Design a protein around this ligand. Structure first.
Ligand SMILES: CCC[C@@H]1NC[C@@H](O)[C@H](O)[C@H]1C(=O)O
Ligand SMILES: CCC[C@@H]1NC[C@@H](O)[C@H](O)[C@H]1C(=O)O
Lengths: 587, 600
């Protein structure tokens, strides 16, 4: 499965915004089969957006259970001789959908599309009732995991183990799509460099021809057959190889953009086209002021303008798969992307407070075999749909897992190996949490380049930069000599509320963010193996409520409404001072 | 404790020495004692203001976090019309440890950080010439200090102070420095105690140490009309038909004790209020009438002076507490400046007086990083510690014994009573305090996690004081569970002890300006909702006779991932501006009848 693009392939975008929405507090929907009649006592909701914060209501915001969307649609008239298929680009956590009293789809996965042919349940020209049942619950076999808890009164409350807030709803595009009656499924392409080759595979209903055209889209070379190899002689050139499906009586044309993408890892260097690289940029989040994680074109354009100004050339889709629009953008603009799945919270050592969670991390009570297989499904879907993007430069299996407990490597080994089985073109990482240090972590052996999320001077060095530097440097050198891999610091940052200034350079002040980030920068400058720096969050984002979070995680370089803290000008001076992709040497 | 009264102005007087600008220098490698810096003018000094903490006067983190010895210094001309008089030099508070040189003669030494210390220094000065005062101030806390702490020395020998209380460990000379003159007939100490029956009439027994001669006393009126007279070094009973010290007003008679020697006279006026506090069952009586405490846990904390006393700050903060409807407060976590107990005396503010014994608990700090494993143990809270504590109670009671505003002593705040030996420690301290002053009740403020089924020592005290934070540190953000937990825990305390219950801390961190429609933690809306639910539960429990929200203003603390620039639990910002909840309380506290519990 890959993204619908239009040519003699058509669609009616159904991000019509306003659907009928209703909560299901007493779980009556399935039994009264609500999809059967117009929702009783509904309210208007926006459909590219989370349902949590759109109504300024704490009881919808913290709601756990089943919610219901509904929307009627007229199917276009020129589709009577076509297959009508219905695609949701992201339903966060779980979705099941009924096209007029007949059930059509079901899917467990919050950041990946799922589609299904409904041509035998539609006829072009008339109006059908679409009803969606969305679930936002997490158990130990979900990606990410969690524990629902039902109190004395029967009220559900969801507990989880990741920082960001558990936003849910229809966060991305809904889509009615038609394609000619022979070509259905997937295409895959792989690219090589010689210090200039390709490959093709199409799955459709008949003969296939493929022609690579360039940005002027004049044909630069053509083959036809499911496989073989053509050759050819800040932001990146994207050719376009146009694959055609000659068969039955109708032809089908699909355009797939390809970039000359190359890379594996070599010793201590993350090369690109046989070129050393330094990652600069951010751990991101899909989080905005009123839409939750809902995608929005304005926000995307503005935050790319911000990363462009600040000099970042890369980022990482922190803790879940992102809106594909962003990877198409990264394609055209030459942004380097670390693709991560929703597998966060595999750790019960991070929660901090005054408050019964399972005692053995890897076991049947928690992360079991079912968990490992749901995980492998998540990696499967992320690779299945982002495989042809040039901007995806590395896969990341999970984020900050607890690898101290027994059973950790028995769990993660088949996943690393299987993912290498899923695509050998790009490297494999697993971002490492602070407390599984160099002397302790179990799984770093299995990955190509190890990524570190370290916060010396914040969570563990009590605001004392002068010792934090020393600790961070030992640990740096230790990691490299233990694995002689490239080191990408994927998370590093401190909570700072915009407006707090202090002569004493204290924690939470803007001066402290500046000083802390630049001391980290000084040690980066001095160790061979660090090939990347991505600060911990570009903007402030929302989290669940707790004594550690003042209205959200304030570790951002920008505020939630995208206004710059002082450190935004620190980074801008450093990241645009170096030349592109090259690390500042030691002074 | 050692005899001591507030220097008050009679026909024998005092000259203020908080001239502010002293010479200050830190002693980074303890060269001070070795070179006895007290001998010559301080080498490489900078001007410091006295009184005020030294930490934030210079906007420099390396002085702020400094641990060790610091040096203050100042020359003084002693007035000559004082010849043939006893000259005494009193420091009202040098925070943690202080020792002082009158040029080259050392006169005093003290380890209590919030209580005065003086010494007769008449034989070391002669009136007319100017002598140099040198003070050595230490800001280190070990396990035998009140409060306790652990200094820890890194690889390089630099000290960093670790402690176990919330507020920041400010130091320096925080209060008045003062030379004062008295006639060679000593009125060293006075003690006054009050009784009443049915508000119609009774008496004030009396005791006095007057080292040098006969004593007569006259209790005078607000009109300074003589209403009774006594004779004798003790006894000194008289009976009245008085207008007695009441919370809303604070009527103060004046006990004028005179000390006639054969040639010299000495006159001391000591303000007295005729009040009787006690507890009966679940009621806290004052002049035989139940009372409802309203108000705050406070702090000595402001924006550039640290804990330095300041008159404007006192006047303005009393203006706010008065507006907001507060009738009481407690001197949270150390003895306060006596100026504030005089103020409360004159205006009828009721005060719960507390010692500096905080941090007797290693279960409160929360984070990701070596604290001792046994709280009560030889390495930690030890026998020396218990005598240090008993000494702290001795000084505080010795200094605030005759204040009508002081209505209760509090030995310590939030100790951990789970480990065995907590009761072994606190029992003799409770009993000793009871013999040092039987006039007022005894409390020990109770921590959230020594709940009613867990606490060990509450048996030993008269009034139960609770610090509760359901909905903040536990049940975070959930008002409906916090209400149930709080209500059954309150009822539980009542069933277990049938004492009066004062909620002495309850509050939530609130960022001024952070507003939210979702009533979530850290918003002003959450502060209002939270305090409001707590208020419904108080109103529904018989035994609760008091509410003091946790913190009047935001204050500074040690750095950590839980404190955003300090503790933000204040109703007011550090610069005294009101958050939204400030108007919630003002509506409650002036809505009720004065001193009466809201009838639900
Ligand atoms: C010490 C763990 C740090 C943690 N790392 C994972 C991110 O998802 C969180 O945002 C980050 C944080 O605490 O902000
Ligand atoms: C659960 C302990 C709460 C603690 N109680 C003592 C006060 O000195 C602190 O300020 C207060 C706080 O943490 O806000």
């Amino acid at each position: 499965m890959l993204r619908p693009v239009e040519t003699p392939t058509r669609e009616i975008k159904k991000l019509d915004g306003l659907w009928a929405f209703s909560l299901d507090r007493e779980n009556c929907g399935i039994d009264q089969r609500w999809w059967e009649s117009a929702l009783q006592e509904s309210r208007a909701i926006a459909v590219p957006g989370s349902f949590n914060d759109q109504f300024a209501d704490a009881d919808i915001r913290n709601y756990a259970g089943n919610v219901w969307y509904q929307r009627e649609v007229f199917i276009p008239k020129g589709w009577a001789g076509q297959r009508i298929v219905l695609r949701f680009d992201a339903v966060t956590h779980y979705g099941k959908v009924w096209v007029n009293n007949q059930e059509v789809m079901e899917h467990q996965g919050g950041y990946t599309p799922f589609e299904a042919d409904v041509t035998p349940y539609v006829i072009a020209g008339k109006s059908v009732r679409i009803t969606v049942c969305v679930n936002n619950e997490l158990n130990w076999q979900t990606i990410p995991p969690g524990m629902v808890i039902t109190d004395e009164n029967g009220k559900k409350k969801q507990s989880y183990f990741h920082d960001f807030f558990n936003y849910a709803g229809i966060h991305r595009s809904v889509m009615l799509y038609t394609t000619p009656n022979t070509w259905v499924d997937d295409i895959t392409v792989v690219t090589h460099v010689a210090q200039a080759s390709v490959d093709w595979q199409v799955v459709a209903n008949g003969d296939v021809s493929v022609e690579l055209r360039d940005a002027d889209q004049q044909v630069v070379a053509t083959g036809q057959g499911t496989s073989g190899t053509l050759q050819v002689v800040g932001e990146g050139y994207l050719y376009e190889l146009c694959v055609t499906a000659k068969s039955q009586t109708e032809c089908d044309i699909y355009p797939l953009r390809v970039g000359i993408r190359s890379v594996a890892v070599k010793g201590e260097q993350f090369l690109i086209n046989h070129k050393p690289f330094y990652f600069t940029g951010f751990g991101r989040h899909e989080d905005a002021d009123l839409r939750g994680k809902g995608f929005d074109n304005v926000l995307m354009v503005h935050d790319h303008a911000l990363m462009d100004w600040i000099g970042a050339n890369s980022y990482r889709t922190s803790h879940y798969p992102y809106a594909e629009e962003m990877l198409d953008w990264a394609d055209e603009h030459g942004i380097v992307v670390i693709d991560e799945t929703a597998a966060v919270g595999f750790n019960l050592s991070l929660g901090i407070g005054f408050e019964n969670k399972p005692k053995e991390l890897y076991s049947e009570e928690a992360v079991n075999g079912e968990t490992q297989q749901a995980h492998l499904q998540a990696i499967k879907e992320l690779i299945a749909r982002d495989k042809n993007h040039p901007s995806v430069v590395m896969w990341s299996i999970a984020n900050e897992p607890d690898t101290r407990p027994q059973g950790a490597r028995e769990y993660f080994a088949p996943l690393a190996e299987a993912t290498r089985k899923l695509d050998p073109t790009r490297p494999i990482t697993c971002v490492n949490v602070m407390f599984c240090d160099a002397h302790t972590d179990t799984i770093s052996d299995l990955f190509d380049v190890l990524c570190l999320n370290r916060y010396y001077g914040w969570y563990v060095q009590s605001g004392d930069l002068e010792t934090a530097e020393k600790v961070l440097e030992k640990e740096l050198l230790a990691w490299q000599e233990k694995l002689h891999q490239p080191i990408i610091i994927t998370e590093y940052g401190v909570d700072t509320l915009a407006g707090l200034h202090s002569m004493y350079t204290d924690m939470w002040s803007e001066e402290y963010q500046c000083a802390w980030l630049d001391m980290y920068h000084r040690v980066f400058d001095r160790v061979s193996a660090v090939v990347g720096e991505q600060v911990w969050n570009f903007a402030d984002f929302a989290t669940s409520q707790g004594i550690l979070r003042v209205g959200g995680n304030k570790k951002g370089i920008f505020t939630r409404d995208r206004k710059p803290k002082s450190a935004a000008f620190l980074l801008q001076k450093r990241w645009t001072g170096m030349n592109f992709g090259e690390k500042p040497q030691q002074g």
